[PDB]
PDB file of C-alpha atoms in Angstrom:
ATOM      1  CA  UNK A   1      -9.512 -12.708 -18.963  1.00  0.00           C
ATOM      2  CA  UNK A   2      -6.931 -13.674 -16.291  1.00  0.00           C
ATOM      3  CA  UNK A   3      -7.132 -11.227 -13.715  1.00  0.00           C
ATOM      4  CA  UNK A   4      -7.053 -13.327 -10.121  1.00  0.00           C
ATOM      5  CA  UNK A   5      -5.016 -15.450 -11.214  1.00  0.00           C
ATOM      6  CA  UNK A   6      -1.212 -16.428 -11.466  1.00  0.00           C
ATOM      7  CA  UNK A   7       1.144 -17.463 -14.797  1.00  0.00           C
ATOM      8  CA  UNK A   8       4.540 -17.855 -15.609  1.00  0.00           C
ATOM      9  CA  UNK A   9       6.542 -13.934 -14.992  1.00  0.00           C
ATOM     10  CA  UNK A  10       8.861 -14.478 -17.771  1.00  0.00           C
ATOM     11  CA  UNK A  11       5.836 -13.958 -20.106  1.00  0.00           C
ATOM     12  CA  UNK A  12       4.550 -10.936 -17.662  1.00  0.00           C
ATOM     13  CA  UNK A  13       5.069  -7.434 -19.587  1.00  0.00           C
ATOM     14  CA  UNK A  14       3.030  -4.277 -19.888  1.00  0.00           C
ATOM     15  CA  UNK A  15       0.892  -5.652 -22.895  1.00  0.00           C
ATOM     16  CA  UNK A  16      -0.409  -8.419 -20.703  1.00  0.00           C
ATOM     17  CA  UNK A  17      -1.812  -5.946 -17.446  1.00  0.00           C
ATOM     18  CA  UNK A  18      -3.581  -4.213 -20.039  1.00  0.00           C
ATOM     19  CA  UNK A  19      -4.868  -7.582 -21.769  1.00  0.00           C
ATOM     20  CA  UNK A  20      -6.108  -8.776 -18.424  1.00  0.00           C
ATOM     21  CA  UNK A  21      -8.001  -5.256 -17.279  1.00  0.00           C
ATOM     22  CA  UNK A  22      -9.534  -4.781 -20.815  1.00  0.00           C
ATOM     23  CA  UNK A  23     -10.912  -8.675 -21.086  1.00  0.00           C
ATOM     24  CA  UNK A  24     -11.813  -8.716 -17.407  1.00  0.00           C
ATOM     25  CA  UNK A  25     -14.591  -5.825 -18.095  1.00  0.00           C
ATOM     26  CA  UNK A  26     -13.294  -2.338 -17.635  1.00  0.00           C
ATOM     27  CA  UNK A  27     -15.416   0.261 -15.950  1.00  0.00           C
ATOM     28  CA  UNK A  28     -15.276   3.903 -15.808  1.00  0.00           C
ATOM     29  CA  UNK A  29     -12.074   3.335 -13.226  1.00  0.00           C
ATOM     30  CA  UNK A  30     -10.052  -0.032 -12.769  1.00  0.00           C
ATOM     31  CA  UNK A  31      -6.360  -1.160 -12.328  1.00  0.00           C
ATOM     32  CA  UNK A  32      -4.175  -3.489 -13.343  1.00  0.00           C
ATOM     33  CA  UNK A  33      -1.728  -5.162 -10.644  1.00  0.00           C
ATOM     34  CA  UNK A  34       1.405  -7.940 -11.440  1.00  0.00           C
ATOM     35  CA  UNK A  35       4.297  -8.755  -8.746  1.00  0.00           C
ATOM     36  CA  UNK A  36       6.522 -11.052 -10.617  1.00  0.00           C
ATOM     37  CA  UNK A  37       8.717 -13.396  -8.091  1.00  0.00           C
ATOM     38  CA  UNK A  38      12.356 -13.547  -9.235  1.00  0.00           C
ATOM     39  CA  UNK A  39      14.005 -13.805  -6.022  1.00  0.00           C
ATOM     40  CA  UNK A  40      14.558 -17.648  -6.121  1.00  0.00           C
ATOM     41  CA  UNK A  41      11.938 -19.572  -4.003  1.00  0.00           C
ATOM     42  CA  UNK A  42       8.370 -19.913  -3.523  1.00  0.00           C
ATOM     43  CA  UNK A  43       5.519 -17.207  -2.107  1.00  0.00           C
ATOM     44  CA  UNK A  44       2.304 -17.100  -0.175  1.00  0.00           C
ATOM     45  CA  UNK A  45      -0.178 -14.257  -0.468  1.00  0.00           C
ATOM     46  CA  UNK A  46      -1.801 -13.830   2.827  1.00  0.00           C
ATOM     47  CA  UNK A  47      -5.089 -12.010   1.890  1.00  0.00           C
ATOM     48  CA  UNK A  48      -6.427  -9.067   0.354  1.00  0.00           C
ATOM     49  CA  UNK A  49      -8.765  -6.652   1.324  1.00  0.00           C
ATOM     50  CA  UNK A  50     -10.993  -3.921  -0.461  1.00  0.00           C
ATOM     51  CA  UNK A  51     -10.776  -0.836   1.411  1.00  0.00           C
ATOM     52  CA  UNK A  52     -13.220   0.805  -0.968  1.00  0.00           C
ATOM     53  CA  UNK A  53     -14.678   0.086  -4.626  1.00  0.00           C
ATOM     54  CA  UNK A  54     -15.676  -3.265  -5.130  1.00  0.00           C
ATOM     55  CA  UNK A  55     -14.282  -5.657  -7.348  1.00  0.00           C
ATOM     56  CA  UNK A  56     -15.127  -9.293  -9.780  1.00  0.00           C
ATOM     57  CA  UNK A  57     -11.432 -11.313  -8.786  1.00  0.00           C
ATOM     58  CA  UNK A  58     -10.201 -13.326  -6.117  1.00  0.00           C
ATOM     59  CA  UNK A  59      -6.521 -12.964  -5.293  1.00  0.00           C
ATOM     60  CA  UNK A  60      -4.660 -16.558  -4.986  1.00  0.00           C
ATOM     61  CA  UNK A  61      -2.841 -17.552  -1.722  1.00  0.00           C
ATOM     62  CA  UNK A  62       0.401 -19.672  -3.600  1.00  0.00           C
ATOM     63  CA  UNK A  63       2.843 -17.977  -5.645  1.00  0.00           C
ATOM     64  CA  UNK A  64       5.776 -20.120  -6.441  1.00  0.00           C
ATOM     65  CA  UNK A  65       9.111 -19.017  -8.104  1.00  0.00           C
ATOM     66  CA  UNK A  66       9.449 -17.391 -11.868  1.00  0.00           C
ATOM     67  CA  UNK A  67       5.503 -16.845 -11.835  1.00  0.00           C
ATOM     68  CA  UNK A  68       3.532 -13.555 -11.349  1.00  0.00           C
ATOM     69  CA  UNK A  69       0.153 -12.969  -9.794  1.00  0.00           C
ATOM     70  CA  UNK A  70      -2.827 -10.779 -11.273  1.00  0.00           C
ATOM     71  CA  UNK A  71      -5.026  -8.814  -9.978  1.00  0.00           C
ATOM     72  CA  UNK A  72      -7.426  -5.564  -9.894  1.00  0.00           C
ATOM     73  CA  UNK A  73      -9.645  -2.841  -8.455  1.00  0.00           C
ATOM     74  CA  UNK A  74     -12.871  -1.603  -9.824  1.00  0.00           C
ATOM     75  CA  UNK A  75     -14.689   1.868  -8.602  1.00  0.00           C
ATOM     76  CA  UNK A  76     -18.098  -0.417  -6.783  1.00  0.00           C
ATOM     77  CA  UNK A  77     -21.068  -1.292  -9.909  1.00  0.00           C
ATOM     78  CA  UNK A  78     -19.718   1.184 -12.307  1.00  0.00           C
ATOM     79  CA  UNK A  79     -22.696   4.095 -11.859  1.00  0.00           C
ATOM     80  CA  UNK A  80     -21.167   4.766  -8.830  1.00  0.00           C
ATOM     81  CA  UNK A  81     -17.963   7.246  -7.407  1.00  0.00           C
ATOM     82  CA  UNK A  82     -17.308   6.352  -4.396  1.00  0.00           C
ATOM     83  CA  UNK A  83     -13.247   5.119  -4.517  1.00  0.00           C
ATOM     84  CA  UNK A  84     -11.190   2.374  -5.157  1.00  0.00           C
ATOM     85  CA  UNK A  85      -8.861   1.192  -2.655  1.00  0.00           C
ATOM     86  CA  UNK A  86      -7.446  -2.246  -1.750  1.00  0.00           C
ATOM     87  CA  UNK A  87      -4.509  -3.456   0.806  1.00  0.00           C
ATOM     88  CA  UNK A  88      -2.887  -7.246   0.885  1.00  0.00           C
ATOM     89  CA  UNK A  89       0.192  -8.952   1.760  1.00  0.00           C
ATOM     90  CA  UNK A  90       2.607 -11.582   0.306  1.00  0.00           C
ATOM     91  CA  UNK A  91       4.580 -13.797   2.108  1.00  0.00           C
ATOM     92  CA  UNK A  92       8.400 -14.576   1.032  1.00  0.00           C
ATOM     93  CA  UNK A  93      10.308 -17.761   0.877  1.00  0.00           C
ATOM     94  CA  UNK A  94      12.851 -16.808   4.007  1.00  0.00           C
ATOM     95  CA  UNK A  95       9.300 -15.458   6.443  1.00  0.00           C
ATOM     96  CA  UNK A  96       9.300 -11.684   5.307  1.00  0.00           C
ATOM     97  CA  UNK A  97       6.049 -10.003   4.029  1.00  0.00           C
ATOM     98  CA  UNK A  98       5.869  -7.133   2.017  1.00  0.00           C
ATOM     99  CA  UNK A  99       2.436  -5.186   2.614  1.00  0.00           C
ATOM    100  CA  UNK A 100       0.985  -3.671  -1.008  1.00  0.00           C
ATOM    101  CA  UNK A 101      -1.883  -1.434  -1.353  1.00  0.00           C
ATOM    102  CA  UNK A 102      -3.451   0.894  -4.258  1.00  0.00           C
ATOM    103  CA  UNK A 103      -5.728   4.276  -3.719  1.00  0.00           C
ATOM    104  CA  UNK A 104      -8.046   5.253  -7.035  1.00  0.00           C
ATOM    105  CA  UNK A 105      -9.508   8.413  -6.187  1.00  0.00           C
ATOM    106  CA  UNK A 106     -12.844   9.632  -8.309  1.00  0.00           C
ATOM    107  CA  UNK A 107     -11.651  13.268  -9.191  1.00  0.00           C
ATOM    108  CA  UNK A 108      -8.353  13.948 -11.804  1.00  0.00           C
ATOM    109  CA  UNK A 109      -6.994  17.227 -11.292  1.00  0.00           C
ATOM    110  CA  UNK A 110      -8.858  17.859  -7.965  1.00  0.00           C
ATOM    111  CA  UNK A 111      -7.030  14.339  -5.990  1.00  0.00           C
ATOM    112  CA  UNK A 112      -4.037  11.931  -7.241  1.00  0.00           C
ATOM    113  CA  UNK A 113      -3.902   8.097  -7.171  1.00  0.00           C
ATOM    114  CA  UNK A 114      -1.214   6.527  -4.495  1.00  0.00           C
ATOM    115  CA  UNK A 115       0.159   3.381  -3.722  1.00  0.00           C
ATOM    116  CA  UNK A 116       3.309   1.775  -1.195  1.00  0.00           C
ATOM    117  CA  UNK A 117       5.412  -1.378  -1.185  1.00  0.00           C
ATOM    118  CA  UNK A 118       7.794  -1.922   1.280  1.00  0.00           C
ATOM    119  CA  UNK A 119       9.883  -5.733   2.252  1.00  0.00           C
ATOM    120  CA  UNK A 120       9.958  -6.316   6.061  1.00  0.00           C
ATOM    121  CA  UNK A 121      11.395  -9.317   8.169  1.00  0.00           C
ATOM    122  CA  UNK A 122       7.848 -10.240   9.720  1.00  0.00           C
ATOM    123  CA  UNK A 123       4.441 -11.316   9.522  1.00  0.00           C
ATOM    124  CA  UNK A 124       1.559  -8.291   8.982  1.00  0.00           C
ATOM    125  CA  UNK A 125      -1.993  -8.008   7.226  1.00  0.00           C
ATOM    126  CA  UNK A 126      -4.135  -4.995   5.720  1.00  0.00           C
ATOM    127  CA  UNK A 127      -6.055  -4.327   9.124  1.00  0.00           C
ATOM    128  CA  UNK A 128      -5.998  -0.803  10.130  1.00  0.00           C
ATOM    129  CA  UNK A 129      -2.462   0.000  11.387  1.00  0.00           C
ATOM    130  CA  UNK A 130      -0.369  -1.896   8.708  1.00  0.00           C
ATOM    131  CA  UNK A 131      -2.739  -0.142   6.027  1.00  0.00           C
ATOM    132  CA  UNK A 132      -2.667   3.141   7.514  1.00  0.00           C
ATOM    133  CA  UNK A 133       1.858   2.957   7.855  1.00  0.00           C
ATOM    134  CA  UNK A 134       1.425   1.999   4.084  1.00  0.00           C
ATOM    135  CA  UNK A 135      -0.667   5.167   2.586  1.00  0.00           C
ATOM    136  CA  UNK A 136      -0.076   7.536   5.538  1.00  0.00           C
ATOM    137  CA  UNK A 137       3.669   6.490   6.033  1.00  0.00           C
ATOM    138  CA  UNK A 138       5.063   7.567   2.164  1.00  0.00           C
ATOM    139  CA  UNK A 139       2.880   6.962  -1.220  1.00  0.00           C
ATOM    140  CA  UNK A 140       5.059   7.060  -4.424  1.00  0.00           C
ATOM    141  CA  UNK A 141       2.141   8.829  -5.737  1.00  0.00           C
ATOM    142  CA  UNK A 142       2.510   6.533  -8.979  1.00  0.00           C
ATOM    143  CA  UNK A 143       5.127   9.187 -10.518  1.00  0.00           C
ATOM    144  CA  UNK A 144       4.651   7.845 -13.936  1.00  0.00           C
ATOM    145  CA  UNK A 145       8.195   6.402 -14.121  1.00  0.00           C
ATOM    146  CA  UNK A 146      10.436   3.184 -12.490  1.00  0.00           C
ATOM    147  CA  UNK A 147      10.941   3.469  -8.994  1.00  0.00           C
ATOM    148  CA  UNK A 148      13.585   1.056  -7.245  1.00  0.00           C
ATOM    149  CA  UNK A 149      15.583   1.620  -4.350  1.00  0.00           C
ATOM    150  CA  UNK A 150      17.784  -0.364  -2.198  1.00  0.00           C
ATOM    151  CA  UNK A 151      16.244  -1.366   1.214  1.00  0.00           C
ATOM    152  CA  UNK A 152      16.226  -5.639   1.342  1.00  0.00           C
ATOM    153  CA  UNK A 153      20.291  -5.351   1.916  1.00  0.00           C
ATOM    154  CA  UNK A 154      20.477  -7.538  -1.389  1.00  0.00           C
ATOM    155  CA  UNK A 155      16.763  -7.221  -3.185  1.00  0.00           C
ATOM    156  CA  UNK A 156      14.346  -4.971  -3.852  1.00  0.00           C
ATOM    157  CA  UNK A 157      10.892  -3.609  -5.402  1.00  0.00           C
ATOM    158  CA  UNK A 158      10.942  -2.373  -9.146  1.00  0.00           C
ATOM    159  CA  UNK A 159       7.435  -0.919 -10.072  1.00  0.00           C
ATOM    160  CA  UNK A 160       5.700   2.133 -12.078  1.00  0.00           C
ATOM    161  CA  UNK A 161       2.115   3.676 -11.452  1.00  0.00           C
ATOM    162  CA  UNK A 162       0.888   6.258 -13.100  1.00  0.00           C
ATOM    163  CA  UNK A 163      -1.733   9.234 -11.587  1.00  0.00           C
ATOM    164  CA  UNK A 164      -4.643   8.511 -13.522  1.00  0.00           C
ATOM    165  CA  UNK A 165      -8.135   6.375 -13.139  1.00  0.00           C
ATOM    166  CA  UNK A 166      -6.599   3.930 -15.284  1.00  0.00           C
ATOM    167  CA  UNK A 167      -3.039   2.899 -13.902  1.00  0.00           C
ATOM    168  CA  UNK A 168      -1.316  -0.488 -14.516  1.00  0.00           C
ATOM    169  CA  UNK A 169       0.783  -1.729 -11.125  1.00  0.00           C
ATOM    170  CA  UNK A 170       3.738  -3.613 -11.927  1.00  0.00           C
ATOM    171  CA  UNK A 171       6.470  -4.897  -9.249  1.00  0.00           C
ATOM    172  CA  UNK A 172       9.777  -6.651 -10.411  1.00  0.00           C
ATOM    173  CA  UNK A 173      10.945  -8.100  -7.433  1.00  0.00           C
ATOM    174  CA  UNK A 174      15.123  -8.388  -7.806  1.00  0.00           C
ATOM    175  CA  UNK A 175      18.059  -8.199  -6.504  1.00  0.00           C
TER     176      UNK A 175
END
């Protein structure tokens, strides 16, 4: 298992969130999350926080350059359908943060999983008003296909999602 963790991004692919999720001990709902720094200096993950669900990991608080984090989001015990939902922020290199959250919902053609990441020059933290500007502001719904658009004036977020239980949560940060 190495979900919680961080390792080297240039070995990060698809392969290895699914590797991670299936070793860690996947339940009747989980996730599978990776935001690989390629932007050119060295990270700081502020915190995370578990909105609803529970979950085994620990998210790290250093994330230098060419290395990816890992982590996930489990629906509470297992026997239970309550959610899974999660919010936590990452620190850049020049002072920016760039707030990431997931939303698992328990019921598949009755709800639809969402998700936002967004890079702006400050400092912010899952609390209640950066969380809520994050999944009531615009969810990309995970739409099953690579989203990217230009918004850092140079860089910005590369990641897919899909809108199942079972999602992996990739983010290529470049420019």
């Amino acid at each position: 298992a190495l979900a919680g963790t961080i390792i080297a991004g240039a070995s990060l692919t698809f392969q290895v969130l699914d590797k991670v999720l299936e070793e860690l001990g996947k339940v009747s709902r989980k996730i599978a999350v990776g935001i690989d720094n390629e932007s050119g200096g060295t990270w700081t993950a502020l915190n995370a926080y578990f909105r609803s669900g529970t979950t085994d990991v620990i998210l790290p608080e250093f994330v230098p350059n060419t290395k990816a984090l890992l982590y996930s989001g489990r629906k509470d015990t297992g026997p239970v359908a309550t959610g899974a939902v999660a919010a936590f922020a990452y620190y850049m290199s020049s002072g920016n943060t760039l707030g990431v959250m997931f939303s698992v919902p328990f019921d598949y053609n009755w709800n639809s999983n969402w998700w936002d990441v967004k890079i702006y020059s400050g400092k912010r933290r899952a609390d209640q008003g950066m969380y809520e500007d994050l999944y009531y502001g615009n969810p990309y719904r995970g739409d099953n296909g690579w989203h990217e658009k230009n918004l850092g004036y140079g860089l910005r977020m590369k990641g897919i999602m899909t809108s199942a239980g079972e999602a992996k949560m990739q983010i290529k940060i470049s420019r």
